[PDB]
Amino acid sequence: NETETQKACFKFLDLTSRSFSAVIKELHPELLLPVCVFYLVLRGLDTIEDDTSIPLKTKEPMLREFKDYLEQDGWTFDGNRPEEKDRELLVQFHNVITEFKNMKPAYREIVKDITDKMGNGMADYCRKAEFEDASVKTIEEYDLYCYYVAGLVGEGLTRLFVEAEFGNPALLSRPRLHKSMGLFLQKTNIIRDVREDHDDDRHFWPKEIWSKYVTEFEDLFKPENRETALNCGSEMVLNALEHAEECLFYLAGLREQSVFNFCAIPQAMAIATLELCFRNPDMFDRNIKITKGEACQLMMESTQNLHVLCDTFRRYARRIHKKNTPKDPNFLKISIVCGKIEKFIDTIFP
Prior knowledge:
By secondary structure, the chain is mainly α. It has helices at residues 4-16, 20-25, 29-50, 56-69, 87-91, 94-101, 105-131, 139-163, 170-173, 176-192, 194-198, 207-210, 226-241, 244-251, 257-277, 292-302, 306-323, 331-348. Helix 10 crosses helix 14.
């Protein structure tokens, strides 16, 4: 029998996550509510962090202390600007508190730890931004931002999977795997969203990459520089593709079907989106997405076994490989990373 607290949590998942609501709801019942809680806690954290109407003096303690708020029955927060999209999740956060405290203790420790590590990373960032530039300047900084977001989400999910025995324990002693899983998704989003992020004064592309192609970041969007813009996105795609093999190692450690589906679907969507963005000038003019018929095929190819998913990965590695052109200054490196992926899949599954 579903409680009203449970119904509220599932409702807010649907209102706050177009994509993940569907996969999360298919999860095995051992992790359905825990991952749902995990999602809403991080979503609540993000609703606070994104709201520029909350002054730093109020916001920074909320982010650092949020892990402790999960223990406070009936916790609520009405300080978001009235137009913040997800504000009502925090207004009604007491449903999340209830379901958090209903979780097995092992799950509560995982969620609270990640809330703690992420809240504090977010706080350190919001602080820097208020006083310094906080512009991503190096590839190292790029990877760190992604770790404090997607990497910690992957850490938490992995710890939940292993605790419930839905994933091989070795997934915890090789943390680059869940990091690559997370960074593959976030970097693909960062690549594809570059224009709309730029039109909201958000910039995540590291200068160590784009300054080799343009003088100022905004130059990427002028039609005069479309060719050098494509070369820039090409190196960004190259950088994301370097995670792809490790994403496959990770998927090979998953031992329960609904967990496999939950992890495989976004990864397949990511490589397909990277192949669409590669050498595609539209990426700089608008927000592009793979076609409906492609997305449908991918859902079927991601909800079976590792062999089928790897074949899908090999298919998109080959397409990128074929688009790759010698005029691109990243030509050799793109084809080498695609070859590594294809040859690795051929070795696992001739």
